[PDB]
């Protein structure tokens, strides 16, 4: 779920900074955004959703 | 009869909500707050696809909130 | 064997004669059935009309009046009308009614439950009586409840006890409470109803005792029959949190099974099998003689005999004779029947993912270190002593 | 995860496509399939995905009273499911815990 | 003690609970047999569940309570040692049989010890927030007379003499083919008596020496617990008797 | 007043559509003006966590 | 050969033929008519049906009023939830008229042509009763002093009334029977009611509560009020251990439906009007779930202990047994009566049922003393510690 | 006047019948209503129940409600986050709000009779719900005699034999044990041929009603 | 109150088991692998160390490895929180025995003083039984090299080879299948614990963080109680590893 | 759920109502007080040839001139015997004499019922014992039979039966025994009443019969001495 979670915060990315094509720059933010997700996960020991 | 019929219009609702991938539309959007008063056949995704997550607020953020009120 | 021959001939004769020659030459009388009963019946179905709505009787009532709820939401109070018998009418049939004036025209209706069709499992067992192998004597003591008075109910009338009726399977298990149940239904060839006792124990409050009484009516109809309540010792320990029912629901549907079974109204050869783990988890009364007639108690199967059921089982999964036999029985001591099945099941299993059709000696094996993982083999018993 | 589509395929795709091959060969059907492992291994996408590959309907019981028209209630609901999925045959029934509710 | 909660109450069927729970876990398996001799008392369990990986040498199921008192023990359940609950009953007897032999120069003698065996159980009972012990005791000895002696106590605390008794997977079906076996050459001869528990312990399930442990006791001289090697040997010597009378 | 329930009776059950309909109309998105709604209870802990 | 393969195909051709007839003359549909008794009971509801009776609608008295058109009119309440406003008929005579009963009314011109019959509310509770049925004495264990004590109270005022008046005590009513199960507290209900010969409701103490609150309270409510009307009722309240427990409250579901029943008991029969004529039998392992209500006289007015039964009484059940039994009286009922005492009525038939067992493997139609001796040490020593009594007993 | 009264302490102390003399003193109706009959099986309408119960009384003339059981009608502890009824929820607070003068209560009065306060919540009992509280103690040893006194009279006695010396004997007894002692003694009294009860037969009369099953001889002495 | 609350878990079944030695049967199961295997020249037990973490502090010589006397050494499977009282106790018991008797204590003596106390919390007291069942191993004059173990009521079995955690079946069977009796010395014997905790394991692979293995051996007349190093250890690991890599072959 | 401690509506403990029970489980012993002497007959009932019936007893020693027959459960009485013959030698330390049957009997009563399931000492019982015993003995007074109870009441006799014909047989006891019937007789008197509750007919391994007699200590019948009783039933 995490890492298709990858792909879908790269098209958040794409359109912020108007792009027609999902670049390496918007994956780069992505890991490290989805990271921050999995650190969530893990503190709370206990799923995200609800 | 009551119970019967809650449930009836909640699966129209269902039959009615698949109906707009064909066309431009956007689908229902719902909160919940208490899930367990709620069916969790509701909350299954294939017509879900975006799950919105709010959490409580940290310090910083709600600071920004209390200056709009005031 | 001649006398017998000819009596069947005449009983059957008889009903068909006497109940033609009445009407036919009655005809050519002048004055008694002749054109009227012919007519009567026609009547009835011009009375009726279409539509014709549908009811079921609760009750009759000695008074010419009936309570049939009509299927319209309200009840009616019907009248024995265009002709029809009160007292041939038995009680929960469905019937039909004349809309026009409320009468019952006739029977004929039962409108089919769902129901009655979840209790009615049929049998149809994987291994079943002489194809188990040792402790033969195990199995013949719970005979003389189950099987015993449905092959032969003679002896029991002639001696001239009560019938029995009721067995609590216990012990340890792993000697196939569940196989035992199922031979034991093949053999007698009776009706199988099964039920599972979970069952009993439902989200509604207080529908419970009601289930009770419905198995128990399907079982008499059915008679002999044979009931399988797989483990009742699973209601009164648990509490699943799906009611509010409580410790009280428990109570009142373990209550209700002694009610039908001896009680204030019997049911006619009905017996019950009721496997359980343990004794003393139950309910008291539940467990009292003269709601069972035979108890016992079933200890696991011996290590030699673990070798005889295993030659069995390798030939049903395709006969092999390159296997370590003797091996995969012993590092496991003393346990269940279920482990045998689970090591043959599994073989054959990793012989088809491998690419044949044989189970060979590597395959089974591989089945014995996933066997472990899945169950713990027989160390339990080892460590203590 | 190489390891886990093996074991999966076997037991529970084969008799559903094919009981014929099972029934020559001389293994009784499986009856339980038990799912267990840690918590986001795919393992409810994985029945889902098993239903598609069969082309088996997946019914699952989700412990709702608004799935249940059947007797209104699922846990003395036990032949009246297997009747119908019969008739809709294969079908894979699901029974799952999502650990919130 | 805090505790006191009842684990043992009174039945109006004239029991106590735990005793009748015990009694039936001695029906259900562990055979143990015991003949009596007449020079020599052999005891036997058979059972310690060898698995050709264990120990056998320090494995005890049969304690020697004294030099001139042995006690082969029996209970099973899915739990299926219950030496530990034996480890208790064993102890207390080691004392009081050397405590015995301290005040009176008498030799203590297995009708002492099976007093003793009817009042543990029985205090256990009495005191508040306590149960009796699951064990069964073959309780074997020499008197002050020297004669061999073999007693049988069961989970009440109620004990009697008896030449042979078995117990265990069917305490009579077990007896009652051995009860042929005992005859008056079978008693004099010592070797003979050996030979008498280990044709018991077959009948139930036959084969192995390793599972059969067995301990004899000769005179007031110390127990003496055999090898399993001298066990397999005489299996084997015992299978060709059975087809010899038959 | 209403609680989570959802193991209860046909009674639980209709209380719950009117508690729903209570919250929308303070402060949903319709809301009062100069006029005042007043409510009346005997423990403020019968009521739903949301109300 | 001929003959008969001659006669089963024409037989059964013939049924075909005659089909016609077979559902007028014998039923199951279109008459099911023999006109002995139908021409009678068709004949009656004939006149009823011609003016305004059926379709008869069942309704019921809401409330009298005297307003809109003529001076007796009442306010009836169908079925389907619509009040109506309706008139009387003398057309045909109403008979079992009374506020908040079920009254009959037509659908085509909305009148009373006929009240539905007393207190019918609940048709459920009424089908599953059995009238008095015959159990034979020679099944009802013992002779003993327990059966004759709870006689005294149950048959004699019943049988006769005529005694109680003439003294000018007042008559029995209440009988606690109570002690643990298998003494036959239901066995002993059964015979002594056909003794009698007064009229039987056994009830179940579990269908008296269902689902919702207070629907506990109609059922219990409407059975006490039919028992009084018709003319002598015992009302054999059967088995209730915890469908009889004292009043508290869980907030999650609570005691609620359970005292809903009991107390409907207790409003009815103190009330403010006392109990009719209704005699109470109470059946009850535990004493000490009951409400302090119920425990005290006016319902229970003598309490009867009827539990295992003593030394002399055990032998008395081995003889009753044996005569239901075709097996010898060449074996000495005293020799199984001592060999297992503390044993109750049920364990001492398991004794002959087991002797019966061991006998049908030897293969004999005739039961052992071998076969006795051997049933009554495995009864004494096995089935001890299942049995029932040492905690029922404590509670009794 | 009082909104209610309430009548609460050990049954058998003659409640109900209590209730019928009051209704004689007053000459007014006595409303019977049972605790179990206002909360019902229809949902919604069992609150409406309550309503029109009271309702009516107002109409009737003044009147005075006997109600039985009231411990029935509901015990509001509530916070149950899990189903908890309410039937019985919305009848509770309906009765509180008829007591409430909304509608008036000096017009009716209730005789509330109720085994136990323990069982019952603080809502409904108040002192301007209900305003006198009377315990009802079990009969005392002069008030056994008397509840004797006027059973005499329906069957016949000796003048050897009262109430009073049994009352001083065993304080084990209640008004409604009472009359079973006396109705108990009658059937031995008949059954031996006798136009009366002696001493000797209740005296009998008050071992028999009470059970035994083995008896005493030497069992205790 | 207080009988209805004590939920009669004292209480002897009909079977002949006690509810709560089998619970705690349960609680050793989950918990990790401890086994001990015989050699001819000392003994070796091997025990899966569960504190990994890149910040240690290592404040105890092992928290499963634990020296209960200077001639005894014992492993851990079951609960650590029973283990520190337990271990404590052993200890006592140990010494106070090397005291009077002055030679090693016996296995079989080590285990039986604590079975008592096991015994008297499952049948009456209502005090929960330890949750860790023991394998101890020493030597001792006179039977020469021995291994104990100990269950939850106390119940003691003499073993060659025997494990006991997780995956125990799969452990003793494995175990069983190469080694029956006492076929091998002390070097070959640490490559096989190190083998079967490396199965059992999730970690098919192991590092000292993983394993902690302890050996006693027999030098010079007297008992040696060493807890090997991380630097020994992976010396072993490297040897089973070694020869995996071959059975593939 | 209620305790086993409370005073039932009756008017007796549960727990006392019980222990009669276990009483009527066990064997059947006779103790027949004549002014010849005190014999006590207790049924062996075996059903095994493998015991040795000496072994089988019974028939327990209070003291050197006074024997106990005891019925119920077998074990449950031991202890009470245990107790017993600390006391007897104990009372010839003080009076420097020996123990009477009243004395002892008595004193173990006081035990018979103590009984405090919760909060009460472990070295006082729980529950009181099923066991009703039969001291018989010849004493400095003279024959004397006393009778004990499980509900502690102690009483004279000259007659009793304890066992599962207790009720039977102590009415057939009265019948037969009385005080002009001789101690020969008296044996022959508990051999008859013995069939019923035993499974087979009366022998010389299946009775135990011991008599203390005037001037003479406690002596327990030889093999001889039970079959000439058998000769003449």
């Not at chain 1, 992505?30 to 609800?50: C, F, H, P, R």
């Not at chain 3, 194809?131 to 001239?160: A, R």
């Not at chain 7, 251990?241 to 609620?256: K, L």
């Not at chain 9, 973490?53 to 200077?70: A, C, M, P, Q, R």
């Amino acid at each position: 779920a995490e890492v298709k979670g990858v792909c879908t915060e790269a098209g958040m990315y794409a359109l912020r900074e108007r792009r027609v094509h999902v670049t390496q720059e918007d994956f780069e933010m992505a890991v490290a955004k989805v990271m921050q997700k999995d650190s969530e996960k893990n503190m709370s020991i206990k799923k995200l959703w609800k | 009869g009551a119970d019967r019929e809650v449930q009836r219009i909640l699966l129209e609702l269902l039959n009615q909500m698949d109906g707009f991938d064909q066309n431009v539309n956007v689908k229902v959007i719902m909160a919940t707050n208490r899930a367990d008063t709620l069916d969790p056949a509701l909350l299954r995704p294939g017509r879900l696809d975006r799950k919105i997550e709010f959490p409580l607020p940290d310090r910083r953020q709600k600071r920004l909130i209390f200056s709009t009120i005031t | 064997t001649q006398c017998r021959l000819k009596l069947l001939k005449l009983e059957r004769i008889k009903d068909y004669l006497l109940m033609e020659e009445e009407f036919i030459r009655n005809q050519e009388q002048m004055k008694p059935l002749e054109e009227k009963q012919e007519e009567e019946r026609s009547k009835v179905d011009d009375l009726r009309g279409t539509p014709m709505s549908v009811g079921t009787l609760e009750e009759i009532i000695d008074d010419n009046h009936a309570i049939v709820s009509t299927s319209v939401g309200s009840e009616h109070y019907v009248s024995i009308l265009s002709f029809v018998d009160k007292d041939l009418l038995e009680p929960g049939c469905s019937v039909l009614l004349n809309h026009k004036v409320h009468a019952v025209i006739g029977v004929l209706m039962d409108d089919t439950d769902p129901l009655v069709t979840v209790m009615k499992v049929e049998k149809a067992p994987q291994e079943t009586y002489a194809d188990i192998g040792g402790l033969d004597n195990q199995i013949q003591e719970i005979k003389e409840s189950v099987e015993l008075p449905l092959t032969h109910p003679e002896y029991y009338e002639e001696m001239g006890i009560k019938p029995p009726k009721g067995v609590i399977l216990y012990g340890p298990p792993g000697t196939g409470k569940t196989l035992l149940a199922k031979a034991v239904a093949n053999q007698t060839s009776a009706t199988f109803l099964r039920v599972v006792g979970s069952e009993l124990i439902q989200k509604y409050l207080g529908d419970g005792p009601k289930l009770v009484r419905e198995l128990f009516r399907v079982a008499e109809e059915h008679a002999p029959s044979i009931v399988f309540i797989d483990e009742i010792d699973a209601i009164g320990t648990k509490r699943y949190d799906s009611n509010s029912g409580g410790e009280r629901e428990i109570q009142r549907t373990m209550l209700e099974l002694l009610n039908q079974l001896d009680g204030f109204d019997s049911r006619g050869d009905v017996k019950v099998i009721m496997a359980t783990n343990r004794i003393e988890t139950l309910d008291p009364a539940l467990i009292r003689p003269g709601r069972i007639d035979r108890k016992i108690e079933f200890p696991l199967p011996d290590e030699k005999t673990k070798k005889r059921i295993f030659q069995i089982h390798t030939s049903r999964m395709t006969l092999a004779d390159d296997v370590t036999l003797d091996d995969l029985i012993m590092a496991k001591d003393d346990l269940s029947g279920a482990d045998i099945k689970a090591i043959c099941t599994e073989a054959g299993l990793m012989a088809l993912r491998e690419r044949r059709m044989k189970v060979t000696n590597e395959d089974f094996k591989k089945s014995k270190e996933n066997v472990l993982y899945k169950k713990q083999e027989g160390t339990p018993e080892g460590l203590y002593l | 995860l190489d390891k886990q589509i093996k074991e999966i395929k076997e037991v529970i795709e084969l008799p559903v496509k094919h009981p014929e091959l099972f029934e020559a060969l001389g293994i009784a059907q499986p009856k339980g399939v038990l799912l267990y492992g840690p918590p986001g291994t795919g393992k409810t996408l994985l029945a889902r995905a098993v239903a598609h590959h069969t082309d088996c309907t997946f019914i699952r019981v989700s412990g709702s009273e608004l799935v249940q028209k059947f007797i209104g209630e699922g846990a003395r609901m036990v032949r009246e499911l297997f009747v119908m999925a019969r008739e809709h045959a294969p079908s894979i029934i699901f029974m799952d815990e999502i650990d919130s509710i | 003690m805090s505790y006191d909660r009842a684990i043992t109450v009174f039945s109006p069927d004239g029991h106590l609970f735990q005793v009748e729970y015990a009694q039936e876990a001695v029906k259900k398996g562990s055979t143990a047999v015991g003949v009596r001799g007449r020079d020599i008392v052999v005891l036997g369990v058979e059972k310690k569940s060898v698995a050709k990986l264990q120990d056998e040498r320090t494995v005890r199921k049969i304690c020697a309570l004294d030099d001139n008192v042995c006690m082969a023990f029996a209970v099973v359940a899915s739990v299926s040692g219950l030496t530990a609950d034996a480890r208790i009953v064993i102890n207390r007897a080691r004392v009081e049989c050397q405590s015995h032999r301290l005040t009176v120069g008498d030799p203590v003698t297995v009708e002492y010890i099976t007093r003793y065996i009817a009042s543990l159980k029985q205090r256990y009972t009495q005191s508040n927030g306590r149960r009796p012990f699951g064990i069964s005791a073959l309780i074997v000895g020499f008197d002050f007379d020297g004669t061999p002696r073999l007693y049988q106590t069961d989970p009440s605390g109620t004990y009697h003499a008896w030449k042979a008794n078995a117990i265990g997977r069917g305490a009579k079906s077990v007896r009652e083919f051995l009860e042929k076996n005992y005859t008056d050459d079978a008693i004099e001869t010592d070797d003979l008596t050996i030979k008498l528990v280990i044709k018991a312990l077959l009948e139930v399930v036959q084969s192995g020496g390793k599972n059969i442990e067995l301990a004899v006791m000769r005179r007031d001289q110390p127990l003496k617990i055999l090898s399993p090697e001298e066990i397999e040997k005489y299996v084997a010597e015992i299978e060709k008797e059975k087809e010899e009378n038959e | 007043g209403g609680r989570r329930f959802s193991e209860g009776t046909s009674a639980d059950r209709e209380i719950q559509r009117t508690l729903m309909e209570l919250l929308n109309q303070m402060d949903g998105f319709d809301t009062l003006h100069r006029v005042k709604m007043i409510m009346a209870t005997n423990r403020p802990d019968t009521l739903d966590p949301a109300l | 050969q001929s003959t008969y393969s001659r006669q089963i195909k024409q037989v059964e051709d013939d049924i075909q033929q005659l089909l016609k007839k077979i559902n007028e003359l014998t039923g199951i549909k279109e008459s099911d008519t023999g006109l002995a008794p139908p021409a009678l009971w068709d004949l009656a509801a004939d006149k009823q049906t011609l003016q305004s009776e059926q379709p008869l609608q069942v309704a019921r008295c809401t409330k009298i009023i005297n307003a809109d058109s003529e001076d007796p009119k009442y306010i009836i309440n169908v079925k389907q939830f619509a009040k109506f406003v309706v008139d009387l008929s003398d057309q045909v005579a109403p008979t079992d008229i009374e506020e908040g009963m079920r009254v009959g009314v037509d659908r085509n011109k909305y009148q009373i042509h006929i009240p539905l019959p007393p207190k019918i509310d609940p048709t459920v509770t009424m089908m599953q009763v059995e009238e008095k049925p015959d159990v034979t004495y020679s099944d009802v264990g013992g002779c003993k002093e327990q059966i004759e004590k709870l006689r005294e109270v149950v048959e004699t005022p019943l049988l006769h009334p005529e005694r109680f008046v003439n003294l000018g005590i007042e008559p029995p009513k209440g009988v606690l029977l109570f002690g643990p199960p298998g003494t036959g507290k239901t066995l002993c209900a059964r015979a002594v009611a056909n003794r009698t010969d007064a009229c039987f409701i056994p009830v179940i103490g579990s269908e008296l509560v269902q689902k919702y609150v207070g629907e506990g309270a109609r059922m219990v409510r409407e059975l006490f009020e039919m028992a009084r009307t018709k003319k002598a009722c015992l009302i054999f309240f059967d088995e209730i251990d915890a469908i009889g427990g004292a009043r508290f409250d869980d907030g999650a579901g609570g005691d609620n439906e359970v005292q809903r029943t009991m107390l409907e008991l207790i409003n009815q029969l103190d009330g403010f009007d006392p109990r009719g004529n209704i005699k109470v039998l109470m059946a009850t392992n535990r004493p000490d779930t009951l409400d302090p209500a119920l425990m005290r006289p006016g319902r229970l007015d003598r309490k009867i202990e009827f539990s295992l039964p003593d030394l002399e009484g055990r032998t008395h059940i081995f003889k009753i047994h044996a005569r239901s039994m075709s097996v010898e009286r060449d074996i000495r009922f005293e020799l199984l009566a001592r060999l297992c005492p503390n044993s109750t009525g049920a364990e001492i038939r398991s004794v002959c049922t087991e002797a019966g067992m061991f006998a049908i493997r030897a293969r004999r139609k005739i039961a052992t003393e071998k076969d006795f001796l051997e049933a009554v040490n495995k009864v004494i020593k096995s089935y001890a510690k299942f049995s029932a009594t040492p905690r029922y007993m404590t509670y009794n | 006047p009082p909104k209610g009264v309430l009548m609460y302490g050990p049954p058998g102390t003659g409640k109900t019948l209590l209730a019928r003399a009051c209704a004689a003193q007053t000459k007014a109706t006595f409303l019977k209503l049972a605790g179990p009959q206002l909360v019902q099986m229809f949902i919604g309408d069992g609150a409406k129940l309550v309503r029109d119960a009271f309702a009516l009384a107002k109409e009737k003339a003044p009147s005075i409600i006997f109600i039985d059981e009231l411990d029935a009608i509901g015990t509001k502890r509530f916070d149950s986050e899990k189903a908890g009824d309410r039937e019985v929820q919305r009848t509770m607070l309906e009765l509180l709000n008829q007591l409430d003068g909304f509608q008036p209560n000096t017009q009716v009065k209730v005789i509330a009779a109720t085994n136990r306060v323990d069982i019952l919540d603080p809502a409904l009992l108040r002192s301007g719900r209900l305003d006198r509280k009377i315990e009802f103690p079990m009969p005392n040893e002069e008030a056994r005699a008397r509840i004797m006194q006027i059973h005499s009279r329906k069957m016949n006695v000796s003048p050897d034999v009262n109430y009073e010396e049994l009352a001083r004997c065993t304080d084990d007894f209640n008004g409604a044990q009472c009359k079973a002692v006396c109705v108990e003694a009658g059937m031995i009294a008949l059954r031996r041929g006798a136009t009366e009860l002696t001493h000797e037969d209740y005296m009998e009369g008050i071992l028999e009603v009470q059970a035994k099953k083995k008896a005493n001889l030497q069992y205790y002495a | 109150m207080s009988r209805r609350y004590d939920s009669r878990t004292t209480i002897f079944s009909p079977e002949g088991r006690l509810y709560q030695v089998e619970y705690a049967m349960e609680a050793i199961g989950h918990a990790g692998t401890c086994l001990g295997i015989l050699a001819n020249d000392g003994v070796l037990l091997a025990a899966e160390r569960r504190n990994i973490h890149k910040l240690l502090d290592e404040v105890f010589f092992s928290e499963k490895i634990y020296k209960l006397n200077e001639d005894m050494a014992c492993s851990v499977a079951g609960i650590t929180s029973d283990a520190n009282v337990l271990t404590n106790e052993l200890r006592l018991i140990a010494q106070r025995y090397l005291l009077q008797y002055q030679e090693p204590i016996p296995c079989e003596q080590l285990v039986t003083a604590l079975c008592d106390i096991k015994q008297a919390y499952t049948q009456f007291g209502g005090k929960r039984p330890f949750g860790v069942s023991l394998l101890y191993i020493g030597w001792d004059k006179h039977y020469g090299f021995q291994l104990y173990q100990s269950d939850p009521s106390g119940n003691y079995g003499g073993w060659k080879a025997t494990c006991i955690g997780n995956n125990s079946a799969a452990a003793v069977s494995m175990l069983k299948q190469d080694y029956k009796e006492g076929e091998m010395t002390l070097k070959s014997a640490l490559a096989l614990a190190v083998k079967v905790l490396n199965k059992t394991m999730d970690v098919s692979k192991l590092s000292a963080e993983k394993v902690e293995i302890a050996t006693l051996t027999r030098e010079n007349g007297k008992t040696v109680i060493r807890v090997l190093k991380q630097k020994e250890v992976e010396q072993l690991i490297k040897k089973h590893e070694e020869e995996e890599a071959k059975a593939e072959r | 759920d209620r305790g086993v401690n409370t005073f039932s509506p009756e008017g007796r403990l549960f727990q006392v109502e019980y222990a009669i029970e276990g009483h009527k489980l066990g064997s059947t012993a006779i103790g027949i007080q004549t002014s010849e002497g005190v014999c006590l007959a207790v049924e062996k009932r075996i059903t095994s040839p493998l015991m040795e019936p000496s072994s089988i007893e019974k028939i327990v020693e209070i003291d050197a001139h006074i024997g106990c027959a005891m019925s119920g459960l077998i074990a449950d009485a031991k202890t009470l015997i245990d107790k017993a013959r600390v006391e007897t030698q104990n009372h010839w330390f003080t009076y420097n004499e020996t123990m009477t049957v009243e004395s002892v009997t008595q004193a173990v009563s006081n035990l018979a019922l103590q009984f405090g399931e919760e909060d009460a000492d472990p070295g006082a019982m729980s529950r009181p014992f099923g066991v009703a015993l039969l001291f018989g003995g010849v004493d400095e007074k003279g024959p004397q039979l006393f009778h004990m109870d499980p509900s502690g009441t102690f009483v004279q006799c000259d007659a009793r039966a304890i066992g599962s014909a207790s009720e039977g047989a102590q009415s057939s006891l009265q019948e037969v025994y009385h005080k002009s019937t001789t101690l020969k007789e008296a044996i022959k008197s508990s051999l008859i009443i013995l069939k019923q509750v035993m499974e087979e007919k009366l022998n010389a391994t299946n009775i135990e019969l011991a008599t203390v007699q005037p001037g003479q200590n406690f002596h327990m019948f030889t093999k001889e001495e039970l079959e000439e009783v058998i000769k003449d039933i």
